[PDB]
Amino acid sequence: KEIPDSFMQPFQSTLWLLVGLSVHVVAVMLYLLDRFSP
Amino acid sequence: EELETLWLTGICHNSSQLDIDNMAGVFYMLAAAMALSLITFIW
Numbered sequence: 001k002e003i004p005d006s007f008m009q010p011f012q013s014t015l016w017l018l019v020g021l022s023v024h025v026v027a028v029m030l031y032l033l034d035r036f037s038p
Numbered sequence: 039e040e041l042e043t044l045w046l047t048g049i050c051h052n053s054s055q056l057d058i059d060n061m062a063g064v065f066y067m068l069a070a071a072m073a074l075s076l077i078t079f080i081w
Contacts, residue, residue, distance in 0.1 A: 012055045022068070029075070 008016075 006054045010054065014055075015057060015061055018061070018064075022064075026071075033075070033079070
């Protein structure tokens with residue numbers, strides 16, 4: 001017995017990259033609303 | 039029951055990629071964000 005980290009690299013990299021692209025698009029859209037303020 | 043315990047005996051029973059249903063909620067919150075952004079943008 002006693003046979004022994006899923007943090008970033010053994011953690012999944014698909015949906016984490018999806019969240020990164022999502023916050024990228026959110027930052028672009030919020031700066032676009034900041035520039036074009038009616 | 040003793041003979042079935044002697045012969046027919048098993049074990050009683052009941053991941054980082056388990057968020058296959060959370061991402062649907064991510065998509066719904068993204069759609070709600072886009073809808074409310076259009077509401078704030080038209081006025």
